[PDB]
Write a protein that binds this DNA or RNA. Structure first.
Ligand SMILES: *C(=O)c1cnc2ccccc2n1
Ligand SMILES: *C(=O)c1cnc2ccccc2n1
Ligand SMILES: *C(=O)c1cnc2ccccc2n1
Ligand SMILES: *C(=O)c1cnc2ccccc2n1
Ligand SMILES: [Mg+2]
Ligand SMILES: [Mg+2]
Lengths: 8, 8
DNA sequence: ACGTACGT
DNA sequence: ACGTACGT
């Protein structure tokens, strides 16, 4: 759920 | 030389 | 001359 | 329910 490298 | 994850 | 960064 | 981010 977090987006720091994928954002899902 | 750049540091964006290792910085060497 | 190498690896850091998050939760829904 | 998954991967992005740089050059000395
Ligand atoms: C986001 O909160 C989140 C949490 N756990 C995960 C596990 C695997 C892929 C995506 C994820 N996203
Ligand atoms: C993004 O590509 C990415 C990859 N691995 C991680 C690990 C822990 C926190 C954040 C991350 N983001
Ligand atoms: C920094 O400018 C730089 C450039 N190329 C590299 C290759 C391998 C490890 C470290 C590096 N750092
Ligand atoms: C840092 O851990 C890291 C890893 N791979 C990269 C690829 C391209 C640009 C920056 C990067 N930084
Ligand atoms: Mg460490
Ligand atoms: Mg891409």
């Amino acid at each position: 759920x977090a987006x720091v490298x994928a954002x899902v």
